PDB file of C-alpha atoms and ligand atoms in Angstrom:
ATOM      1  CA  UNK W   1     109.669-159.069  39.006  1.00 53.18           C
ATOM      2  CA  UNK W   2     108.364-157.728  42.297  1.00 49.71           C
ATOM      3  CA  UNK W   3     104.924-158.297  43.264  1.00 48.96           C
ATOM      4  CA  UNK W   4     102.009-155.842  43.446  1.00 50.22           C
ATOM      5  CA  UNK W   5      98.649-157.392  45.370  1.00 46.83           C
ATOM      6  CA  UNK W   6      94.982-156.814  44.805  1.00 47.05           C
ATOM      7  CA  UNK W   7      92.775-157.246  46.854  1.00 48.77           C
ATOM      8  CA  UNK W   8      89.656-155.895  45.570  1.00 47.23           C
ATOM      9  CA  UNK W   9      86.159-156.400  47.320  1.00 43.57           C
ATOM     10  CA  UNK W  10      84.579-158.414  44.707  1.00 41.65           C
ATOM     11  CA  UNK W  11      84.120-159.387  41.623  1.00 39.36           C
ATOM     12  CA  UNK W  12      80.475-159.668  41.087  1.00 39.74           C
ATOM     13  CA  UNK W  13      80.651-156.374  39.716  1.00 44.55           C
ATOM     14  CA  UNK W  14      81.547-154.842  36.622  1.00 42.82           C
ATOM     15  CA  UNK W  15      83.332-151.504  38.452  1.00 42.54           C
ATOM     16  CA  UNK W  16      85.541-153.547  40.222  1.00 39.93           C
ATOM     17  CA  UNK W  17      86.213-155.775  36.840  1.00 39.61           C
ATOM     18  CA  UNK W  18      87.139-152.694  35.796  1.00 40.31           C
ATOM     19  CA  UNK W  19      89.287-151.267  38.299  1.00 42.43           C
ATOM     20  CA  UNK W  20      91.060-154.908  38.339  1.00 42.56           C
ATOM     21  CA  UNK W  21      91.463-154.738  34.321  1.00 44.65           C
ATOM     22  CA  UNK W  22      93.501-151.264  34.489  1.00 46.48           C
ATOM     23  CA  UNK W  23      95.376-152.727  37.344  1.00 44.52           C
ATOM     24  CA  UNK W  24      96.355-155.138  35.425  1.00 46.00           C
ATOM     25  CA  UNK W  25      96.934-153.325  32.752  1.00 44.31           C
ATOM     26  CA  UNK W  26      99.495-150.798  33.930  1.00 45.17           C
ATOM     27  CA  UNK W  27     101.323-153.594  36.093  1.00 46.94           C
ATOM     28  CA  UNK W  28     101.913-155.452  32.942  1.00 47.03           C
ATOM     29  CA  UNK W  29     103.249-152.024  31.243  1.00 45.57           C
ATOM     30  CA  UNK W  30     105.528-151.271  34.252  1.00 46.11           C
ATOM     31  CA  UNK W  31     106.870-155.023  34.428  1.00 47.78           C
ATOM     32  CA  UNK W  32     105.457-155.973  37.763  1.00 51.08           C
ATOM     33  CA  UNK W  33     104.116-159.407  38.951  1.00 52.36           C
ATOM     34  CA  UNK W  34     100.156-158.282  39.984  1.00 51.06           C
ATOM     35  CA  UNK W  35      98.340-160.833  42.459  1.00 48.66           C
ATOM     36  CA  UNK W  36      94.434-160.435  43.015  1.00 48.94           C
ATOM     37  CA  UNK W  37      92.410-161.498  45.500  1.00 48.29           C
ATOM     38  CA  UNK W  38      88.715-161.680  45.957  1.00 50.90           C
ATOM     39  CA  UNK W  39      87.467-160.721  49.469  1.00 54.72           C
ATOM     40  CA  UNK W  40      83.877-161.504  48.535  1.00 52.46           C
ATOM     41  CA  UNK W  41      82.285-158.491  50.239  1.00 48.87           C
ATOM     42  CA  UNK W  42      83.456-160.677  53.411  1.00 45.98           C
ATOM     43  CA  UNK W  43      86.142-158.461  56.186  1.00 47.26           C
ATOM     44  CA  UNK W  44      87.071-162.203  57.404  1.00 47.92           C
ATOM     45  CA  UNK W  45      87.772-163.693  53.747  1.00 45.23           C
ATOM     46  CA  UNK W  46      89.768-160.028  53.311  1.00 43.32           C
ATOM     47  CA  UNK W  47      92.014-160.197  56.596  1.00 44.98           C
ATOM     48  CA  UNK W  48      92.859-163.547  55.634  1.00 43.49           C
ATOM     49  CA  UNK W  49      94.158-162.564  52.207  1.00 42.25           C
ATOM     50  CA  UNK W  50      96.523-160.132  53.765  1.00 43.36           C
ATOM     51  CA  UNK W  51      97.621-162.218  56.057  1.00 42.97           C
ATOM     52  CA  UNK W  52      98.200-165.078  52.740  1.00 43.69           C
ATOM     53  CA  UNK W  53     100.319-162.223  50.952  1.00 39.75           C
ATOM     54  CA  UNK W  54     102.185-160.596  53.497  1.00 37.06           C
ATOM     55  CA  UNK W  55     104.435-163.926  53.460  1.00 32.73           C
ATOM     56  CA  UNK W  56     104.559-164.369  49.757  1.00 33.42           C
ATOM     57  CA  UNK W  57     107.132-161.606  49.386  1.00 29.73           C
ATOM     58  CA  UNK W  58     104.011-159.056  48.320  1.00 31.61           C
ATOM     59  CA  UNK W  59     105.608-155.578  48.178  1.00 30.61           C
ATOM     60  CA  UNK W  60     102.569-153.479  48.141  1.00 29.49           C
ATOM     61  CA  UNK W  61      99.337-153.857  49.051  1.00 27.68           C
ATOM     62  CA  UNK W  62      96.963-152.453  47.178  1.00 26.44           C
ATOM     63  CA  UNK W  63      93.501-152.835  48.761  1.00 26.81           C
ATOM     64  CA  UNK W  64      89.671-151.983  48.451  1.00 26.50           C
ATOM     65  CA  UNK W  65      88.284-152.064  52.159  1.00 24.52           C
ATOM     66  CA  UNK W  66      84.845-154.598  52.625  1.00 23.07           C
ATOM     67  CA  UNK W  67      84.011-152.119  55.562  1.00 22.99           C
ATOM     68  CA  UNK W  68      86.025-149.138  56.536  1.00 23.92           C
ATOM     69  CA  UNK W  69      86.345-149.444  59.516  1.00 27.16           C
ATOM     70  CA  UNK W  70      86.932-153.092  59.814  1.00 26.31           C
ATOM     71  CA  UNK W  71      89.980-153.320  57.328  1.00 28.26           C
ATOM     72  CA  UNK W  72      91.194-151.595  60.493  1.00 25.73           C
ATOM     73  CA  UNK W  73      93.097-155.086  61.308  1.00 24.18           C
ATOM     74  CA  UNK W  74      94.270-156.309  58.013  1.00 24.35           C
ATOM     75  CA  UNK W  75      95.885-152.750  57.068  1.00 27.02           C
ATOM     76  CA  UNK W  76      97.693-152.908  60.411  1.00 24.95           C
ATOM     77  CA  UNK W  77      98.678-156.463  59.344  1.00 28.32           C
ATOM     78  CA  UNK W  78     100.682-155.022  56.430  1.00 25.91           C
ATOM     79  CA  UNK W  79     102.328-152.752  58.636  1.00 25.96           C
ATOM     80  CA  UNK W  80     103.920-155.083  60.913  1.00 28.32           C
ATOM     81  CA  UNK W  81     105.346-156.794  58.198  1.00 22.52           C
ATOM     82  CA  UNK W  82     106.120-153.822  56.521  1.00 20.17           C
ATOM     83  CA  UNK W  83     104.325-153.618  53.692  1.00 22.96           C
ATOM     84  CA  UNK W  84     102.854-149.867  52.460  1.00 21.62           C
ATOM     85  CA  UNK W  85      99.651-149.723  51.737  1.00 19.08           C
ATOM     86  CA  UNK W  86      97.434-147.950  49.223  1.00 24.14           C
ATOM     87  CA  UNK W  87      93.971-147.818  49.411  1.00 24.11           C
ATOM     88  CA  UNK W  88      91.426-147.666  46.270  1.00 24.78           C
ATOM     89  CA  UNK W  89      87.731-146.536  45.966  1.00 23.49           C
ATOM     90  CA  UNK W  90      87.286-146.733  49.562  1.00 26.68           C
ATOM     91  CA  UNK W  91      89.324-145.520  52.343  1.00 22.33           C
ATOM     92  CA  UNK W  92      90.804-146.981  55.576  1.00 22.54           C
ATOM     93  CA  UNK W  93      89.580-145.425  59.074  1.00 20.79           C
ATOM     94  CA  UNK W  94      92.595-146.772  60.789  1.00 18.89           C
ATOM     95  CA  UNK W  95      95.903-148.434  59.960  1.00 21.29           C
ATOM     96  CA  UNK W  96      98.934-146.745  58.366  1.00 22.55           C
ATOM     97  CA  UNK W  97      98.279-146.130  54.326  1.00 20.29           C
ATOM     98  CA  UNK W  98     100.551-144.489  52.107  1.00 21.02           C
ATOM     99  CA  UNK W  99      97.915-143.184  49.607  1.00 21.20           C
ATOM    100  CA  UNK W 100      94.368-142.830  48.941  1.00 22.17           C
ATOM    101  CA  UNK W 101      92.913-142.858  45.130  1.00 25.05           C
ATOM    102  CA  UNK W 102      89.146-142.203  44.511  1.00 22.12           C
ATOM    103  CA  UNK W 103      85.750-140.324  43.324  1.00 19.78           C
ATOM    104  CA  UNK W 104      84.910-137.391  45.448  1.00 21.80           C
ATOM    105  CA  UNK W 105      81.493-139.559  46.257  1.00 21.57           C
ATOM    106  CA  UNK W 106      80.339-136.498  48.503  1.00 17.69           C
ATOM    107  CA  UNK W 107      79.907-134.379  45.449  1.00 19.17           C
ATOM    108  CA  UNK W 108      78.846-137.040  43.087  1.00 20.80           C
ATOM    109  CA  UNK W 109      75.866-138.085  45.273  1.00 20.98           C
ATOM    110  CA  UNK W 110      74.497-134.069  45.118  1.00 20.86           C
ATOM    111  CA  UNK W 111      75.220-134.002  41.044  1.00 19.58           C
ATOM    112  CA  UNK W 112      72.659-136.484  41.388  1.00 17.46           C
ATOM    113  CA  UNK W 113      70.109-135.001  43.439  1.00 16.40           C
ATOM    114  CA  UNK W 114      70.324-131.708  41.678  1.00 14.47           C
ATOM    115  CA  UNK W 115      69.811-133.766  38.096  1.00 13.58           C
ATOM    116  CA  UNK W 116      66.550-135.664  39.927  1.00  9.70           C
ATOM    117  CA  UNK W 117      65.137-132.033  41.312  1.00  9.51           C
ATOM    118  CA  UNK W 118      65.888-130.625  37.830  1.00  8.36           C
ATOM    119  CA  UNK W 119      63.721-133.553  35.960  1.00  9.73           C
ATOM    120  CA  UNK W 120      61.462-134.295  38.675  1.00 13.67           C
ATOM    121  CA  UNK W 121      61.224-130.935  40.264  1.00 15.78           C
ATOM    122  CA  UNK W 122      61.504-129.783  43.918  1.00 17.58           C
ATOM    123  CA  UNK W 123      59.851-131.290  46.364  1.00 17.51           C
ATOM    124  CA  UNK W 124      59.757-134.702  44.616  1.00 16.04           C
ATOM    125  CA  UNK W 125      59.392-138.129  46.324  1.00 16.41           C
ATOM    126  CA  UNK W 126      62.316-139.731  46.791  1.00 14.25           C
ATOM    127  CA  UNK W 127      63.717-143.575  47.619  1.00 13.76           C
ATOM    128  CA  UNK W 128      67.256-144.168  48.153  1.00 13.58           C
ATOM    129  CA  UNK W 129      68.761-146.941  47.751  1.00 11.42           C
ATOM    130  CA  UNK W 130      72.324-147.121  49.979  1.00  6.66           C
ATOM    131  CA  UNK W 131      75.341-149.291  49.324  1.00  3.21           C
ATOM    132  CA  UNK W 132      77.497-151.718  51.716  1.00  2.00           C
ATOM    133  CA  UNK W 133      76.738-149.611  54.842  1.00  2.09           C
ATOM    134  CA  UNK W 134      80.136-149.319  56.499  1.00  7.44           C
ATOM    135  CA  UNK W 135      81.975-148.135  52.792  1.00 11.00           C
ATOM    136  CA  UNK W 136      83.041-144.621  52.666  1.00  9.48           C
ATOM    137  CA  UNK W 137      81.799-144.601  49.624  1.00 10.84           C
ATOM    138  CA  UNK W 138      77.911-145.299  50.699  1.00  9.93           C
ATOM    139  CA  UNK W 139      78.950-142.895  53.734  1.00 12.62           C
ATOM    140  CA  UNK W 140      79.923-140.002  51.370  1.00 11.13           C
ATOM    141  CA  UNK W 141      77.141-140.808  48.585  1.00 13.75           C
ATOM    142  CA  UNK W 142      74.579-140.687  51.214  1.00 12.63           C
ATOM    143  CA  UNK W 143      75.577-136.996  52.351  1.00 11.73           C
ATOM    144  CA  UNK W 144      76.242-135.684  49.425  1.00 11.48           C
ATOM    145  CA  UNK W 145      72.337-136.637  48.584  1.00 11.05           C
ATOM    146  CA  UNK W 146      71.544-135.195  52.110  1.00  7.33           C
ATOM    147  CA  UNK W 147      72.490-132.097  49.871  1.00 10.52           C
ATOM    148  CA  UNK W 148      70.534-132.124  47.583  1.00 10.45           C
ATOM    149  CA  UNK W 149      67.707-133.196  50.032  1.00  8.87           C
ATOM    150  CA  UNK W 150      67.862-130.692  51.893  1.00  8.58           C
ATOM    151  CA  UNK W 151      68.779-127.916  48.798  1.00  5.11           C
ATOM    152  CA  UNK W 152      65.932-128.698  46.787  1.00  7.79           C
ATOM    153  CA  UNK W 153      63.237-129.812  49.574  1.00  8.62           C
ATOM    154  CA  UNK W 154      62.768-133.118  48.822  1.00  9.83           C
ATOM    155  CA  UNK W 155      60.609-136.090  50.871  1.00 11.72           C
ATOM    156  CA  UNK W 156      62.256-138.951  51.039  1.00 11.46           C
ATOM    157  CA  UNK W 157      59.953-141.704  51.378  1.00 10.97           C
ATOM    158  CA  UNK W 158      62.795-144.233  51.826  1.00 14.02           C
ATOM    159  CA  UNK W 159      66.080-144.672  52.169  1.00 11.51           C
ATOM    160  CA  UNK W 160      67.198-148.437  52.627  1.00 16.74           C
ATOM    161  CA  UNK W 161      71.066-150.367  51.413  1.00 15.60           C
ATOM    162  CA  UNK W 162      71.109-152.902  48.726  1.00 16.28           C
ATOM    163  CA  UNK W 163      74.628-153.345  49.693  1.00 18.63           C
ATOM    164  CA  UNK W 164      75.563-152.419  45.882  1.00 17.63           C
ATOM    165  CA  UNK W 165      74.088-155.777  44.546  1.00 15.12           C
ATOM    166  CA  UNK W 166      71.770-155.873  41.738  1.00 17.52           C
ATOM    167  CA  UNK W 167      69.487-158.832  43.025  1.00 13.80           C
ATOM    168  CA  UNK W 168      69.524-157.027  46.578  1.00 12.10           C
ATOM    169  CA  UNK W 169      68.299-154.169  44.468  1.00 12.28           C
ATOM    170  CA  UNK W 170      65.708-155.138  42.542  1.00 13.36           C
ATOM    171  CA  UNK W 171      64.043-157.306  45.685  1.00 15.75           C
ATOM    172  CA  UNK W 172      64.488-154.043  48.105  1.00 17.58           C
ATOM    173  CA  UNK W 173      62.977-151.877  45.388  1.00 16.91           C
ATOM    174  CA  UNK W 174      59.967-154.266  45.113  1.00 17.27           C
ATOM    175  CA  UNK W 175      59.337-153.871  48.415  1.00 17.62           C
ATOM    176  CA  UNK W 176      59.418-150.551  48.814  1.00 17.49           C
ATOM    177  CA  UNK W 177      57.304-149.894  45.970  1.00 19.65           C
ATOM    178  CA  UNK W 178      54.377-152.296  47.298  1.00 18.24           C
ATOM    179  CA  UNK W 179      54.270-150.144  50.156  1.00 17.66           C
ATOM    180  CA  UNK W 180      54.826-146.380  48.375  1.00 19.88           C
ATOM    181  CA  UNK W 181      53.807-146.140  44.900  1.00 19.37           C
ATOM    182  CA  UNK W 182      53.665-142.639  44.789  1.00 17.34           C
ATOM    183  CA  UNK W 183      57.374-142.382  44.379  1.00 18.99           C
ATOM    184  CA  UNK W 184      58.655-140.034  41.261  1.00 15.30           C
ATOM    185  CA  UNK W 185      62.208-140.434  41.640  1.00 13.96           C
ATOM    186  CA  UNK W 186      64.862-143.082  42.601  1.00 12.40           C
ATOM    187  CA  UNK W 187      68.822-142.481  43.529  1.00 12.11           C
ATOM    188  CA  UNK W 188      70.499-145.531  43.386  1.00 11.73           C
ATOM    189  CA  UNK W 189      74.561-145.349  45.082  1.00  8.92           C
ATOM    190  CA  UNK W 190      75.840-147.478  41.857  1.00  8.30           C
ATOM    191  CA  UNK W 191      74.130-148.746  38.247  1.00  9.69           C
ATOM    192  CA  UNK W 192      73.981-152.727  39.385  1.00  5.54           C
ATOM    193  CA  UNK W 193      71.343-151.329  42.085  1.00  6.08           C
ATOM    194  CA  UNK W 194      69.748-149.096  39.726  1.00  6.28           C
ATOM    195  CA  UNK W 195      69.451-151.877  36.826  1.00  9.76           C
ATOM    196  CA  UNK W 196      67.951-153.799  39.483  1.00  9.15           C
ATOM    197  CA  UNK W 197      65.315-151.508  40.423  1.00  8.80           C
ATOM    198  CA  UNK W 198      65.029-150.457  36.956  1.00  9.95           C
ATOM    199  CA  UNK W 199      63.852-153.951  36.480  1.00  8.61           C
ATOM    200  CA  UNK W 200      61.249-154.042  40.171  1.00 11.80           C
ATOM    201  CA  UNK W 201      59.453-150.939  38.227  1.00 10.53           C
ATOM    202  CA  UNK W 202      59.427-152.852  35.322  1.00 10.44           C
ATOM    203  CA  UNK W 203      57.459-155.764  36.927  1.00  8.11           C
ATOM    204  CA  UNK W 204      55.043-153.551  38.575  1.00 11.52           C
ATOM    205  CA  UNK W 205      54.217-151.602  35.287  1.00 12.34           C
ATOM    206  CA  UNK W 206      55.787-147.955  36.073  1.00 13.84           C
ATOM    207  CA  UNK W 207      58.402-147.366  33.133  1.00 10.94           C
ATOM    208  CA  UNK W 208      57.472-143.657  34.261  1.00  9.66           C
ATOM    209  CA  UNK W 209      59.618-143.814  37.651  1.00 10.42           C
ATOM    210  CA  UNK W 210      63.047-141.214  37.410  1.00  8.72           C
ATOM    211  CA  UNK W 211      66.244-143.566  38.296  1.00 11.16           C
ATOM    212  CA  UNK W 212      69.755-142.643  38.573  1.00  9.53           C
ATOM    213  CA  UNK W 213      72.485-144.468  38.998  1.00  7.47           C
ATOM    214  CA  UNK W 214      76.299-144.379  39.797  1.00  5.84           C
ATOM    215  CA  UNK W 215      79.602-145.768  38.552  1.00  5.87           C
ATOM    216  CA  UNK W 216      78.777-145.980  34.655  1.00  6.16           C
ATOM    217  CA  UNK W 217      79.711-149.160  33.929  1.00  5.51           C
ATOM    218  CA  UNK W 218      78.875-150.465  30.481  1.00  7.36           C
ATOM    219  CA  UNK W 219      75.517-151.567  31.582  1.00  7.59           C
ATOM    220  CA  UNK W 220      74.883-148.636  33.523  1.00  5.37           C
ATOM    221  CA  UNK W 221      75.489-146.750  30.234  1.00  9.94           C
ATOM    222  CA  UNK W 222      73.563-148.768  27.833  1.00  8.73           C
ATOM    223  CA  UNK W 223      70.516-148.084  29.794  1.00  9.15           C
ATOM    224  CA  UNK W 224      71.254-144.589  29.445  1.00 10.80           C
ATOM    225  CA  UNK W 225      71.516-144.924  25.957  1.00 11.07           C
ATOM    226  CA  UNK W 226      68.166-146.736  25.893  1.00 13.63           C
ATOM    227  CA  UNK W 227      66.274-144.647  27.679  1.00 13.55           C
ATOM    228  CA  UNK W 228      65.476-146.658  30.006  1.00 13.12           C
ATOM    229  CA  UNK W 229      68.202-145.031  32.961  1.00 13.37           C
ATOM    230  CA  UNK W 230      67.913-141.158  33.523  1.00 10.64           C
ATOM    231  CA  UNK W 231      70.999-140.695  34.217  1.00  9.60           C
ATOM    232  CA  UNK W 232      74.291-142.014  35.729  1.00 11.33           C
ATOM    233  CA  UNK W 233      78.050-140.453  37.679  1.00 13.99           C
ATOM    234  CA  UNK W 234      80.270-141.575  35.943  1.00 14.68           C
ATOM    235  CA  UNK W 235      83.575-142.664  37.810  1.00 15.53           C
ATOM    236  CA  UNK W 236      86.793-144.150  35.808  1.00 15.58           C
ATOM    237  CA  UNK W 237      87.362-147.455  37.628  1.00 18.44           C
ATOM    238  CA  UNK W 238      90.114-148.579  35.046  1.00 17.56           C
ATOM    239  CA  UNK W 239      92.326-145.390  36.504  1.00 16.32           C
ATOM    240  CA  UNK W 240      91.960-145.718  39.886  1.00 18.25           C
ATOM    241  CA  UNK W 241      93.454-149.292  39.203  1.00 15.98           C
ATOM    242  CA  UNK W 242      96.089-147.431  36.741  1.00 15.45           C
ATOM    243  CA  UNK W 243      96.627-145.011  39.218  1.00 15.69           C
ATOM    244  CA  UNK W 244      97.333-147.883  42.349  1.00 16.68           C
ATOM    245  CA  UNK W 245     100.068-149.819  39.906  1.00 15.24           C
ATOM    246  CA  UNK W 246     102.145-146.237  39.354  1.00 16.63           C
ATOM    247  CA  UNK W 247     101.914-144.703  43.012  1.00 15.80           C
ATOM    248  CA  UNK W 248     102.775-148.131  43.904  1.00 19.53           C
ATOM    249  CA  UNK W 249     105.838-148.146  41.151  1.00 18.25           C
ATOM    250  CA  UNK W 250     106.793-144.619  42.100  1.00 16.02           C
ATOM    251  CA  UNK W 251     106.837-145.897  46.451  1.00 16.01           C
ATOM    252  CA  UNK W 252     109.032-148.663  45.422  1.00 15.47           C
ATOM    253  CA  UNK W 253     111.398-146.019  43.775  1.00 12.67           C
ATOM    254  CA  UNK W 254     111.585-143.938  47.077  1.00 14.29           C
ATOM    255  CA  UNK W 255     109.887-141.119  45.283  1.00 15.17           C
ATOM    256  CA  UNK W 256     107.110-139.545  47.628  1.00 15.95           C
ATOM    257  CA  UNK W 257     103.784-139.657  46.688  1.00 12.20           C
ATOM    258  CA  UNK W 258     100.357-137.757  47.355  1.00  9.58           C
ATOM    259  CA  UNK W 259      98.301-138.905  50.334  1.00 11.71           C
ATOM    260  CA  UNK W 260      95.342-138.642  47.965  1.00  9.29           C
ATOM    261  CA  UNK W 261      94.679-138.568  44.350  1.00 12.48           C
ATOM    262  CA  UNK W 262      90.963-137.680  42.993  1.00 12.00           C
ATOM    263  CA  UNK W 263      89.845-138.841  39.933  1.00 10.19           C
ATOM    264  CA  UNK W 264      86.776-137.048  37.890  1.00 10.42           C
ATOM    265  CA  UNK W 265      83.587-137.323  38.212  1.00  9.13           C
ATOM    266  CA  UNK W 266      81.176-137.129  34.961  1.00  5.31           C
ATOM    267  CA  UNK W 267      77.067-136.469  35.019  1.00  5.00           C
ATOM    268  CA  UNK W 268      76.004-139.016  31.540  1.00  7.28           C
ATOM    269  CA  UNK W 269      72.709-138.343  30.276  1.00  3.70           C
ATOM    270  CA  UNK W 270      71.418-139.632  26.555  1.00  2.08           C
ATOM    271  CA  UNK W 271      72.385-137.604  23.772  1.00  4.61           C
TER     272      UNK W 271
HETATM  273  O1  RIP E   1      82.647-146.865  44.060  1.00  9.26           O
HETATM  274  C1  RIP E   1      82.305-148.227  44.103  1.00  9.26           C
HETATM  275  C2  RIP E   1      81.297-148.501  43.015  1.00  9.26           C
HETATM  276  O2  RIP E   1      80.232-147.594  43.175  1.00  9.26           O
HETATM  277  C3  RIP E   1      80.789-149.946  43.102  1.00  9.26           C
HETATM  278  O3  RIP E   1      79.741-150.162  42.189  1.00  9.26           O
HETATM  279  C4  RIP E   1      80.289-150.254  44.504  1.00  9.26           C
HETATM  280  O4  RIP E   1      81.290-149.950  45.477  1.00  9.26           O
HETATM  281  C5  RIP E   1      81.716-148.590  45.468  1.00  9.26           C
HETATM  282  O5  RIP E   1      82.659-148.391  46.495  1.00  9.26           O
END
């Protein structure tokens, strides 16, 4: 069998358990030998794991950048030993890749300020928590709010990252809300943020505060059927990991691929 590699950013978190799982998946359908590594949200644990495969006879690298534009040197690793590269969820700012599967996170972070100014109204009060700064996908998320920001008016109290952790959440979120209780409305980049604030309101005694999340990860859709989440963007983690093992397949066969493949976005709401 010839070897596919993972190396996804982490696994404390249920997208990325996910996007590993269809991996996984569709490497097992196609016959291929799938390796994953955890980077641990760490660009120095992740340049060392290319550097681990790229002697290990890996034949692609499928990879899910820490920071943007510091898998810079690990991406260019893979290239001197010849290894193409395919990028998932997040994108590479420099290096050679091959291909580029994810969300269209500039459009899914104004689906959610347009759903906030539609419950809340215009001109609400806003707090936003961001994601791992250097991502893309915080990058994109961030002006696709900007968007809706501007669009609809809003005042953004605050806008601080939580670096996509659910304990960073909840903690930043308790913070900010000791200092601006007035806020109506609260965008957070994925759903383990968003649980977490969901759960900072909770201890102050606001179940009336308007929070949205992202990603839609079985958690992040429970609380949606509960009542408890407004609403979430829904991304399909399990196919950009499908959709990594076949471009990969179809590079190995010579066949040319697509520089980038999107995959849909989906506003959930209970009902
Ligand atoms: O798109 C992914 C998911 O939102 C995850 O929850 C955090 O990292 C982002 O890059």
């Amino acid at each position: 069998k010839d070897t596919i590699a993972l190396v996804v950013s982490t696994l404390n978190n249920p997208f990325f358990v996910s996007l590993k799982d269809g991996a996984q998946k569709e490497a097992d359908k196609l016959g291929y030998n799938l390796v994953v590594l955890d980077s641990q949200n760490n660009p120095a644990k992740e340049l060392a794991n290319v550097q681990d495969l790229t002697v290990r006879g890996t034949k692609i690298l499928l990879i899910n950048p820490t920071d943007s534009d510091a898998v810079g040197n690990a991406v260019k690793m893979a290239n001197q030993a010849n290894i193409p590269v395919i990028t998932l969820d997040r994108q590479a700012t420099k290096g050679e890749v091959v291909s580029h599967i994810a969300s269209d996170n500039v459009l899914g972070g104004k689906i959610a300020g347009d759903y906030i100014a539609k419950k809340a109204g215009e001109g609400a009060k806003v707090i936003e928590l961001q994601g791992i700064a250097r991502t893309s996908a915080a990058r994109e998320r961030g002006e696709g709010f900007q968007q809706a920001v501007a669009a609809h008016k809003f005042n953004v109290l605050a806008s601080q990252p939580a670096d996509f952790d659910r304990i960073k959440g909840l903690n930043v979120m308790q913070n900010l809300l000791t200092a601006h209780p007035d806020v109506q409305a609260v965008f957070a980049q994925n759903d383990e943020m968003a649980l977490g604030a969901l759960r900072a309101l909770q201890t102050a005694g606001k179940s009336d505060v308007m929070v949205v999340g992202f990603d839609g990860t079985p958690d992040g859709e429970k609380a949606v059927n509960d009542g408890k989440l407004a609403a979430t963007i829904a991304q399909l983690p399990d196919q950009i990991g499908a959709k990594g093992v076949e471009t990969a397949d179809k590079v190995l066969k010579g066949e040319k691929v697509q520089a980038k493949y999107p995959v849909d976005l989906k506003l959930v709401v209970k009902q």
